[PDB]
């Protein structure tokens, strides 16, 4: 298995500075030219950086000229970028991607791509996570989860510690006017099975490593 | 730099259907061009080189064609999992340049929303915020209008709309919306009513609750 692992994005405030670093395994990097790829959120794929085999050329898209700088250490088979002076518009996913190598003839497609890491340059800070029940009331009843109040992106919820996937929806998440994210995962599940099976949420928030579960229940009302 | 102009943005297109994407390079690039396919979140996968030939492991009703300045990527019969964004590079040149993107919507039956209401948790209460979301379940087409009624009236900006990603087996989509105001605000009013208008409707559907009754 060819792989690109990147690692190393974040979140930092306006003018500071980040490295991103791709470790490829399963090859040798020295053999191909490498590239940045990165895309903002719901936006397009903007280029961002080349660099040759030889770190002999290097090349940049006009937004990041003086401020990223791509290097290459091949004896560790890892490609870097350092971002110094970050900004609002240099918030994206970043990709570490390979082009295809041929010697006769131009390639400059992406053969691989890294999965991408997430870059967030904003001056809020990294909150974890509220998770509140959404509660089944009364042949199908839903529940689910309210994953509120956090920063940065990503967040991710599983059911059952994974067991329970058919049915889920999580929902993308969305800015909150305070400015931090909140998004909902539900469940549909046979209202028959509602009072003997149980239904535990797991919500993994890694930058803050936040993990919190929750078991979904319908309310009850002893009171006061 | 070479421009990369795509058409359409967006596309409907019903399973089975012969879909057509363009692509149009601001100079000959003469066959320097990759297609890609992104299923959003995770990164694009390449689809085709060199304006037409396919890269292993790709199914066969994706075909690339054209050469210098006009490109076209074709899916001959639209599978239910292609919904997808797909971008065209040139590799003529750096800087590498992409289009700006085709959207690719899968079109199916009209189905009407599952409607949901959920009145916010205890906890959330004892936190001095209430937070009230509807759900609709697995509906098409995404057009779907929300309102939101407290004690009968109808609120104003103050609410928000998540929608799924195209579901890869049904072609159906999802959506959340959530109501928030303070708890001071919520504990003013008694009915907190979800009202769904949808294509697959007839007429309006109202879900709804009292506050706190089991
Ligand atoms: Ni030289
Ligand atoms: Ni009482």
């Known amino acids: 298995e060819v792989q690109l692992v990147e690692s190393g994005g974040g979140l930092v405030q306006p003018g500071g500075s980040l490295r991103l670093s791709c470790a490829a395994s399963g090859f040798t990097l020295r053999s191909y030219s490498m590239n940045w790829v990165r895309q903002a959120p719901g936006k397009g794929l903007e280029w961002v950086s080349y660099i040759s085999r030889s770190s002999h050329t290097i090349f940049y898209a006009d937004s990041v000229k003086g401020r990223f700088t791509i290097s290459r250490d091949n004896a560790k088979n890892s490609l870097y970028l350092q971002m110094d002076s970050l900004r609002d518009e240099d918030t994206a996913m970043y990709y570490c991607a390979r082009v295809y190598s041929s010697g006769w003839h131009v390639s400059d497609y992406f053969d691989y791509w890294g999965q991408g890491i997430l870059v967030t340059v904003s001056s809020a800070s990294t909150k974890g996570p509220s998770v509140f029940p959404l509660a089944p009331s009364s042949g199908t009843a839903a529940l689910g989860c309210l994953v509120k109040d956090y920063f940065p992106e990503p967040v991710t919820v599983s059911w059952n510690s994974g067991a329970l996937t058919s049915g889920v929806h999580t929902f993308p998440a969305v800015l909150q006017s305070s400015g931090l994210y909140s998004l909902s995962s539900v469940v549909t599940v046979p209202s028959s099975s509602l009072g003997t099976q149980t239904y535990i949420c797991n919500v993994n928030h890694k930058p803050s490593n936040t993990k919190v579960d929750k078991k979904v229940e319908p309310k009850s009302c002893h009171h006061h | 730099a070479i421009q990369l102009t795509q058409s359409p943005s967006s596309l409907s297109a019903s399973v089975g259907d012969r879909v057509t994407i363009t692509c149009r390079a601001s100079?000959?690039?003469?066959?320097?061009l990759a297609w890609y396919q992104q299923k959003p979140g995770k990164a694009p996968k390449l689809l085709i080189y060199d304006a037409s030939s396919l890269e292993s492991g790709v199914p066969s009703r994706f075909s690339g064609s054209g050469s210098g300045t006009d490109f076209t990527l074709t899916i001959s019969s639209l599978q239910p999992e292609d919904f997808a964004t797909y971008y065209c590079q040139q590799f003529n040149s750096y800087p590498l340049t992409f289009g700006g993107g085709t959207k690719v919507e899968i079109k199916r039956t009209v189905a009407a929303p599952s409607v949901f209401i959920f009145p916010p948790s205890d906890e959330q209460l004892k936190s001095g915020t209430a937070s009230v979301v509807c759900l609709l379940n697995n509906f098409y087409p995404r057009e779907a209008k929300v309102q939101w009624k407290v004690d009968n009236a109808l609120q104003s900006g103050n609410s928000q709309e998540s929608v799924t990603e195209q579901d890869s087996k049904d072609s159906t989509y999802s959506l959340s919306s959530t109501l928030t105001l303070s708890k001071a605000d919520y504990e003013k009013h008694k009915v907190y009513a979800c009202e769904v208008t949808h294509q697959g409707l007839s007429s309006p559907v109202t879900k709804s609750f009292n506050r706190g009754e089991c």
């Open positions: 100079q000959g690039i003469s066959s320097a």
